[PDB]
Design a protein around this ligand. Structure first.
Ligand code: HEM
Ligand SMILES: *[C@@H]1O[C@H](CO)[C@@H](O[C@@H]2O[C@H](CO)[C@@H](O)[C@H](O)[C@H]2NC(C)=O)[C@H](O)[C@H]1NC(C)=O
Ligand SMILES: *[C@H]1O[C@H](CO)[C@@H](O)[C@H](O)[C@@H]1O
Ligand SMILES: [Ca+2]
Ligand SMILES: [Ca+2]
Ligand SMILES: [Mn+2]
Length: 357
């Protein structure tokens, strides 16, 4: 097909996604792997994972747009605290780009956001999910205080995911920060490169924790190896769940195996997101519009490194059968701040629409 803009595409049904990508990039992402991109990637997961094989379809329809179509229901569950921002940012696109379902908009917006993060893969994108569903029930979203047994079970019940696929999906914590876990600080990053889809989070969760970026008493949080912050440049936060996954025998070797293995991490993430993005649907009934996902920013290709103030003596290793890689350490004895903004500054407020969630 040839779309009104002159673009040649796979199928005519894919055409409408071209001006939607352009509008998302101009209006809320600005081609950056920034705050609003991060919040939309988190929403792709919270929309898709609310589905249960054991409870049946009444519990939820998966990647179905339920967060946008029932904005006063799931976004107010305690485990979804903070998801209101992404929902209120995407509802105006649903109203305007009104030949694309809420469910397709959520998954496609996630693919466009991740393409702004250097090193990310170009996700598969299948289209055609219906625009009608139900609100999901509470209790289906994993939380940072949960055990590994509880987390792996939730992912098995949602879509048959293996432990390898679960840790693969957690490469998204390479481009992720926390606003609600600690009520005294905003935008606490999970690795020292929250604007780059690299393997640093896998390395940095394996370092010994030495302090906290904010208070020492929040549910779901454990000590961080890089807790220093100043002004808006908040220090690194460590979730109990990532820590527990990095040390549990079921997942410790998979966690370590992504350290300094960028192409392996990105291809494994692509494969598991291919499964997550179609929860609630038969993939044989969705059309392939992968050709309209933007081409992702490339990485520089540099190896993973220990950040200044850390080194191999700080590692807490848990995988007996695989050799930890040889990595260099950045010079300096004291911690470097983790910038609040992609261009290195401290000041870069993102667009936020008000809305019903
Ligand atoms: C056991 C699994 C998981 C748990 C318990 C978990 C937990 C969390 C927590 C507590 C936050 C901080 C939210 C806040 O306070 O603002 C967060 C942020 C984030 N999560 Fe996860 N998550 C998990 C899986 C996933 C997966 C599978 C993805 C996507 C493929 C994902 C993508 C993100 C993103 C991108 C953010 C950053 C949001 C931002 O910076 O604005 N998470 N996660
Ligand atoms: C999917 O459902 C949503 C919600 O019902 C539809 O959104 C409405 O869209 C029209 C324009 O087409 C707006 O005037 C309304 O205000 C929107 N409703 C709400 C509650 O926001 C959307 O049009 C549907 N999309 C498709 C592809 O059928
Ligand atoms: C980042 O900043 C720290 C000091 O905060 C240095 O030690 C490091 O070398 C880098 O310049
Ligand atoms: Ca959903
Ligand atoms: Ca990173
Ligand atoms: Mn956020």
């Amino acid at each position: 097909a040839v779309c009104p803009d002159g673009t040649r595409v796979s199928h005519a049904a894919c055409c409408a996604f071209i001006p939607l990508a352009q509008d998302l990039q101009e209006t809320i992402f600005q081609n950056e792997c920034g705050e609003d991109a991060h919040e939309v990637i988190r929403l792709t997961f919270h929309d898709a994972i609310a589905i249960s094989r054991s409870q049946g379809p009444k519990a939820g329809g998966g990647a179905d747009g339920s967060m946008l179509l029932f904005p006063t229901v799931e976004p107010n569950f305690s485990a979804n605290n903070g998801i209101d921002d992404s929902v209120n940012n995407l509802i105006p696109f649903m109203q305007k780009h009104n030949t694309i379902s809420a469910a397709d908009l959520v998954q496609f917006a996630g693919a466009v956001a991740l393409s702004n993060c250097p090193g990310a893969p170009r996700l598969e994108f299948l289209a055609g999910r219906p625009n009608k569903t139900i609100a999901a029930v509470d209790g289906l979203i994993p939380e940072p205080q949960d055990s590994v047994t509880k987390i792996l079970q939730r992912f098995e019940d949602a879509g048959g995911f293996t432990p390898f696929e679960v840790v693969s999906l957690l490469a998204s914590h390479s481009v992720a920060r926390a606003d609600k876990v600690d009520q005294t600080i905003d935008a606490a990053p999970f690795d020292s490169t929250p604007f780059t889809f690299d393997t640093q989070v896998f390395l940095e969760v394996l370092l010994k924790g030495v302090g906290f970026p904010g208070s020492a008493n929040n549910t779901g949080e454990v000590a961080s190896p890089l807790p220093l912050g100043s002004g808006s440049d908040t220090g690194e936060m460590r979730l109990q769940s990532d820590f527990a996954l990095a040390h549990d025998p079921r997942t410790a070797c998979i966690w370590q195996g992504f350290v300094n293995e960028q192409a392996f991490m990105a291809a494994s993430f692509r494969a598991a997101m291919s499964k997550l993005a179609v929860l609630g649907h038969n993939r044989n009934s969705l059309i392939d519009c992968s050709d309209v996902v933007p081409v992702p920013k490339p990485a520089t290709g540099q190896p993973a490194m220990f950040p200044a103030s850390t080194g191999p003596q700080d590692l807490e290793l848990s995988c007996p059968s695989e050799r930890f890689p040889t990595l260099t350490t950045q010079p300096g004895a004291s911690q470097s701040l983790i910038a609040h903004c992609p261009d290195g500054s401290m000041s870069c407020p993102g667009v936020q629409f008000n809305g019903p969630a």
